[PDB]
Specification:
part of a larger assembly; 4 chains; A mainly alpha (about 400); B alpha/beta (about 375); C alpha/beta (about 300); D alpha/beta (about 260); B: about 375 residues; alpha/beta; six-stranded mixed beta sheet; three-stranded mixed beta sheet; globular; D: about 260 residues; two-stranded antiparallel sheet; binds zinc ion; General transcription and DNA repair factor IIH helicase subunit XPD (chain C)
Chain lengths: ~400, ~375, ~300, ~260
Amino acid sequence: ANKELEEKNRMLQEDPVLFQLYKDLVVSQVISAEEFWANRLNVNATDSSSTSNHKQDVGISAAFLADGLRYNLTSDIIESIFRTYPAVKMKYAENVPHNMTEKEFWTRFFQSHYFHRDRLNTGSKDLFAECAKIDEKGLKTMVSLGVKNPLLDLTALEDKPLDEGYGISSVPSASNSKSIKENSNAAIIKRFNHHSAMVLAAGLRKQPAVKRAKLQESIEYEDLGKNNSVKTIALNLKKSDRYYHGPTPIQSLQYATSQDIINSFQSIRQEMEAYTPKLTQVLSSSAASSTITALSPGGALMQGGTQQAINQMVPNDIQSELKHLYVAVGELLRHFWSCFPVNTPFLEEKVVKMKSNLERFQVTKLCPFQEKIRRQYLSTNLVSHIEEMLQTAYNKLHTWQSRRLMKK
Amino acid sequence: ERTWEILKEDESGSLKATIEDILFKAKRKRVFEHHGQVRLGMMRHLYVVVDGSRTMEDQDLKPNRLTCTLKLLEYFVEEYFDQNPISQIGIIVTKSKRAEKLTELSGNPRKHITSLKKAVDMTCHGEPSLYNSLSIAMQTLKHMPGHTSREVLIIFSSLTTCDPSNIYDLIKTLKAAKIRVSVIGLSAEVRVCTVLARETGGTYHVILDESHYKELLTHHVSPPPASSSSECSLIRMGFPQHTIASLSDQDAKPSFSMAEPGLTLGGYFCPQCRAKYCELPVECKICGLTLVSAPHLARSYHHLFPLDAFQEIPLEEYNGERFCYGCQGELKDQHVYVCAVCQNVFCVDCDVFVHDSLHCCPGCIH
Amino acid sequence: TSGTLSPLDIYPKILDFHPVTMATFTMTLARVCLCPMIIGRGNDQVAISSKFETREDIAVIRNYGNLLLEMSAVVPDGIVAFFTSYQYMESTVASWYEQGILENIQRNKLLFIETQDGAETSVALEKYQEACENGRGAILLSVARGKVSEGIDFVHHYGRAVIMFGVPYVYTQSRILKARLEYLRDQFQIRENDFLTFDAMRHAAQCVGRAIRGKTDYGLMVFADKRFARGDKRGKLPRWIQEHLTDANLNLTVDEGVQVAKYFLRQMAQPFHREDQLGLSLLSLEQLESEETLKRIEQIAQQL
Amino acid sequence: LNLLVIVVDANPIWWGKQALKESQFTLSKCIDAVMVLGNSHLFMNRSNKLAVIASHIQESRFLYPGSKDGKYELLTSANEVIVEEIKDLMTKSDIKGQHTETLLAGSLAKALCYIHRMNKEVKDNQEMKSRILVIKAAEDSALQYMNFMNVIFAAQKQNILIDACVLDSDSGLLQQACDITGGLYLKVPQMPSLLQYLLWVFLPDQDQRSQLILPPPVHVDYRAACFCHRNLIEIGYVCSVCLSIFCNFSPICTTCETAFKIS
Ligand SMILES: [Zn+2]
Ligand SMILES: [Zn+2]
Ligand SMILES: [Zn+2]
């Protein structure tokens, strides 16, 4: 697939020789041509594991931009603005930065709503929130909030709800004496409230339980009732002797006769009753010297060791090639085992493994090319560790293919 | 206008020299907690979440929260493996309204602690995104086998977190995924984390002092309890024997562990794939079969049958020997401990060291 | 029956009433839930107050912005800010926005500004309550006189801190107030300054009174006005609240309040469960059948 | 500063048979070597300290720790208490069959907690290094495997080196302890000359193991078997609930009340 090409680059960028070997194996049928790359393809869901939570900082994050005049060195920042304000989204599509620099647009961003929060559409990038009463019509006019009975209902709690002039109300904004100083204050309030409420809605769709939740959360008291208790399981062991004896195989232990026990207790008691330390009983030069011979650097107690010396021929060349071979073979066996160690037998995994392993039969052919160096360029060397693993990789599939009782 | 007069002798006569005797309990401690004979999540995949936000620069503790946190994290990482080599660790940092997986799923303190050392240089920036953090974690835990206790430990420094969507999405998912999440907060209690922890099955605690911080971390060292909702599995496990290059390295080529760059001539082979591994226990990166050393298994069996607290008394009123059983020595301290079963004489060090470190009472073995 | 009114001595005069009992009850707790404090002193040593007949004094507004900014980082979940007047609130917010302080506050918590529109009130409270529960944190600001202080209870996580900016004096509509004050001087011989103190204090006690509704509930409360330091005003607050308003926390600096808050939060953020409540502040049937309950509770009542 | 803790397998069964066998080497000659070795540890350094414990069938008795008679103080007092303590233990001996194994784990537990007290008692200007020397003669009692493994890890955590000397019968557990703790396990081929092995293999300091050329450690095969039919296992299945090992797949933990959730 075309999408896999971009993600697979990680493997080739990190291991170029392994990628070359992977591509070589791809061409040499040691692995599938796609698998050479597709074995590394993986992606996330967005600019991050979770959509960037630009509910905070928004454009305020960048003092205008990367600079008093705003420079043009911010992307994700302006993308957060695009996500924050759909009006800017609409205008950011209009003010195309092609063959120019956003320097001017980033400078204009400090205009009104986005930086000074004025009222009417003085924004430098459209404004549907300019009609902030019509922008709020689908929130608290024609539509409503989701808790509006359980809470946030202080608009209709008093005796003023039934009738207005019924109260002693006189504080509210009159039709006489309206002001533009107040319009600036109201704009800041409306801009901050609408911004906060709208931006929050992006992360908070929307819930039918809100009202009932707020009722139960405030009516129930965890002090007088409503406990909190655990639900683990009591671990009553069965035949604990098993752990006492431990997971060890049967020893060669054997009892004697009660007579031998009785005599043992007696003989040792009698010996300890009749015992005194003596230098002759402590040591003899014959014993010490004989023990020194056994412990000597050429004695019976000097068992086999230090046999893992440096390699018979071209360790450096072998190690250099083995690095690539270990990465490649390891990455190959990885998938083969992933397909082989499945939870259940099915043709989707069996055929994918049998093809992958059949390609690995050309990797053993590619290892035969890697075997020529050890049998030609190298004077004497054994790479049998990989060879034994490679043999096991085929053996396991042959053994599994013989399990035709629905296992194969 | 009180600090130069805050000494105990400010309004007392005997406090002119008994001040450090009147306020003598100034710096001590005495750690002990309960236990229970319940199933434990011995197979453990614990992931650490640490605030990477500017709030980590505050000096609520002796050094900035970052230094004290990383200091105790390293210690916690060590003991976590030390008390459970079977388990694995991973770390994620919540920076710039984003989350960065400082360390992947692994059991190698070498790499984990190495990452911590390097993480000391991190830049505390932006606000935390609890949602992004849990996303990366759960995305990883999704692939972990149900029987392996999938757990996350969160260290929260700030109070406000930037989530791109209501965390109830994740909590509902985590609850359904049976993943457990615990949180440790700095200086405050946050409803978000409290609801998150209590609903998810973990616990929310607040740091008071570096000792309290250790005290809380200590609790998280012990494996969590498990319910019947988790997979009661019968996991396949390998116990490969170490194999040197005995025959002059004949037919046994040296090899680097799957996974490490160290080419080892001898070590543990995989009974499943014959791969080379210099260390044990190691997960077969190319098979899924975990390889564990037989002693590492027994290393955790104390959690299955741990000791019980001994009968404490200010004097050996039972008139046992003047010499404390177990470790021989005089009852120089006017506090004695007696095992409920074997009823031998034990001292302060016996009650502490035998119960917290030996986990076996000598008289009970008799 | 509620604990919001004080001093009780003024209501029989005001209501020309004579009760059989004039009692009060002390909040009985094993772990206090409330830390009333008067942060009347700015870090710059400015006497944070509204003594200046609500005149335009940037220095106190500036100090109010500094306090709120730092306190927004210190208090967990939600904050509830009450202003003395709607005008002053609007005037104040405009200054903090112009001075940029308000943006640093947004970074700390989502601001929600009240307005006479029920749409604003309902939406603000909707978003605030859930913002206090979602990953973020919110900070409600309103007026100590408006319905918001009447209809909304700041239970548990909602409004974990209540801040009273300035003494809530309504010097507007003075004519009507004078008339009622004068009539109180006439038929009731009540001093205007005395009544004014009481009237504002009861409003402060309303915001504070709605800040807690249970034992598994608590509320930080800052009285950002030097006035509150007068023994008379402190003395006219509810006696059960005055118990926690220890002299040591009078006219605190902003830093002192922040430090005391961090301390107070640290001391109560710690686990304290239902079983831990049985030590003190909660009596089970066993304790009720124990006559101790009959003798111990006697001292909980107070009278005025 | 060092603290040697000698452990001797005071098993009357093997030593009694050894006595009944009238072999060239007996417990008498053994304790002689131990006393001389113990003396050598203290003799080697004015600041060195020593403790000795005997693992009997039913008791872990301290042999320290000296006498006050004043004929000779340092070595004679230690040897006299040792003789007296072994005589008290072995002369005043009972006879039992119900519990015939040597209390090895209890003796090791006593040693570890005793070392802990001593190392705490020591000032921090210089610190007391310590090691345990186990002289095993009887059979290896599996019933203590749980305790044995737990005490190995305690020693490991406490950073204590454990050495072991085995006479006749070997021990998988004890050889495994030497490997884990970084000590050394040795099967002495000439029990009458035991002391010479001790004065060379187990006597050298921790700071000298690295400098001396000594027999390389014998590689220990980690043979393991499940509780079900005890067969050997290289790959098995483990109960994630109780960590009981089962060689082959099954539906329920025979070791506990738990039905596997199989899919
Ligand atoms: Zn493998
Ligand atoms: Zn006991
Ligand atoms: Zn089981």
